[PDB]
Design a protein around this ligand. Structure first.
Ligand SMILES: OC[C@H]1O[C@H](O)[C@H](O)[C@@H](O)[C@@H]1O
Ligand SMILES: [Cl-]
Ligand SMILES: [Cl-]
Ligand SMILES: [Cl-]
Ligand SMILES: [Cl-]
Length: 472
């Protein structure tokens, strides 16, 4: 609440940061206008900055999908392998194992990555099918990075995101890279489909919630998927086989973490500039860099180090541990917003124990305000992607299936995101559950969604129907 004890000199800095990080309802509406134009440009013949990548899911799941499938999920804190049993009445069951990523995987080689993944797949298959199998197990591969797909079992990596920086993969088809390592270990796996995590979120959540119109991730990254219609995808004109007609649905992985790399509308601050310049891929993922869980603690770190350098805080402290980029992950602002003490004892312990920095009560109130500003900005900017897709497609109502560490775990985040949509549309509604466009907990898109997409894909191929451009 209250700040009576904070000197005027520091209150001026807090007021400057509030100004710098606050996004007005009108600013969200103007961002949304420009976001719609950039979504449409990405579907155009000439293309645009936002990839808008077709995912070759050309139908809705009916709920009657049946059978056992493997899902391989690259992009959680761990690698995950899942055995998914579809039940045939909108029901499923799963069991899974998680595998710790090698140290420095993100800056390692392609060969390291594909060898580690195949090793984990063989461990899983040996554990769950110790007696072997009569036919190759069908697998859906969730690759949580932007990949061009000429057909559903191909994925050519466009750019590493979220800190990744593995040489030899951007511009390469990852499905053959995975397949060669599967073969080398003689694992009986049929890679039926590659999907993005948003596309899986969309499809898995539609299997149990028929009002789903988007699948979004608000986690280590930020992105969304939805279904367009083939007639609305100009860049597919002349490329489609005859069985996929103009009225067919087509799921789109927007990769809208990329939005506004031109820096024409988002309220980038000097802290966002540094994050982008110091990241592995400068010039890329502008919207995600402002919003997602890989970055929110790094925005706080850079603000704190500016306030120190300018003489305002930590004046008598050794701040050496604060100089390490990414040392403050989003668990810092999360714990700070959760601290239930008046004088922020939990925050005191966090800075002393983990950073060796003694704080005053007034400095912890400043830090708490900073965490709140950064989280609120993230929520208000992130729902502009939802508003943009819904306005573009003419959805006045929607369940928006959401997943990811920030939506699920960041204190207060679901309430702020729902308030930001309420503010965009000027609804009168009182309770979150009554919002006409509302975020709801998703089904597991990287596990259950990859399995349903593998199932739908196999059914198409058994029927002789297409799952890629003509000549694929
Ligand atoms: O995991 C969430 C998102 O993170 C990044 O934005 C990735 O580029 C995107 O492929 C993924 O959907
Ligand atoms: Cl002061
Ligand atoms: Cl494309
Ligand atoms: Cl600035
Ligand atoms: Cl509607």
């Amino acid at each position: 609440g209250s700040m009576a004890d904070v000197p005027a000199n520091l209150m001026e800095q807090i007021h400057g940061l509030e100004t710098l990080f606050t996004v007005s309802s009108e600013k969200m509406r103007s961002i949304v206008k420009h976001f719609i134009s950039e979504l449409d440009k990405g579907l155009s013949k000439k293309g645009g900055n936002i990839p808008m990548i077709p995912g070759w899911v050309v139908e809705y799941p009916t709920g009657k999908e049946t059978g056992d499938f493997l899902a391989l999920d690259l992009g959680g804190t761990n690698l995950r392998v899942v055995l998914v049993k579809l039940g045939g009445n909108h029901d499923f069951d799963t069991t899974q194992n998680k595998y710790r990523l090698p140290d420095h995987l993100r800056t390692g080689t392609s060969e390291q990555l594909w060898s580690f993944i195949a090793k984990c797949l063989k461990e899983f298959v040996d554990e769950w099918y110790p007696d072997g199998v009569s036919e190759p197990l069908p697998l859906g591969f969730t690759f949580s990075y932007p990949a061009s797909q000429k057909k559903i079992n191909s994925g050519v990596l466009q750019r590493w995101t979220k800190g990744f920086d593995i040489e030899g993969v951007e511009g390469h088809d990852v499905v053959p890279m995975l397949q060669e390592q599967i073969e080398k270990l003689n694992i009986p796996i049929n890679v039926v489909a590659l999907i993005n995590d948003t596309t899986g979120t969309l499809v898995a959540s539609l299997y149990t919630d028929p009002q789903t119109k988007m699948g979004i991730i608000i986690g280590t990254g930020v992105n969304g998927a939805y279904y367009d219609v083939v007639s609305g995808i100009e860049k597919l004109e002349g490329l489609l086989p005859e069985d996929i007609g103009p009225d067919s649905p087509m799921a789109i992985n927007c990769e809208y973490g990329s939005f506004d790399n031109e820096h024409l509308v988002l309220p980038r601050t000097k802290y966002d500039v540094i994050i982008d310049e110091e990241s592995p891929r400068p010039g890329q993922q502008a919207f995600e860099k402002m919003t997602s869980g890989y970055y929110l603690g790094e925005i706080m770190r850079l603000v704190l180090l500016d306030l120190y350098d300018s003489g305002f805080i930590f004046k008598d402290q050794d701040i050496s541990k604060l100089k390490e980029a990414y040392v403050m992950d989003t668990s810092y602002p999360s714990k700070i917003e959760d601290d239930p003490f008046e004088n922020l004892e939990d925050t005191d312990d966090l800075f002393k124990t983990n950073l060796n920095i003694e704080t005053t009560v007034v400095e912890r109130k400043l830090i708490r305000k900073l965490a709140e500003l950064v989280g609120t900005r993230a929520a208000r900017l992130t729902v502009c992607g939802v508003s943009a897709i819904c306005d573009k497609r003419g959805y006045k109502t929607a369940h928006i299936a959401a997943d990811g560490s920030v939506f699920n775990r960041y204190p207060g985040y679901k309430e702020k995101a729902a308030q930001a949509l309420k503010d965009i549309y000027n609804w009168d509604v009182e309770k979150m559950e009554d919002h006409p466009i509302q975020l709801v907990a998703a089904e597991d898109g990287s596990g259950v969604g990859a399995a349903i997409i593998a199932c739908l894909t196999q059914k198409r191929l058994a029927a002789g129907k297409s799952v890629g451009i003509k000549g694929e």
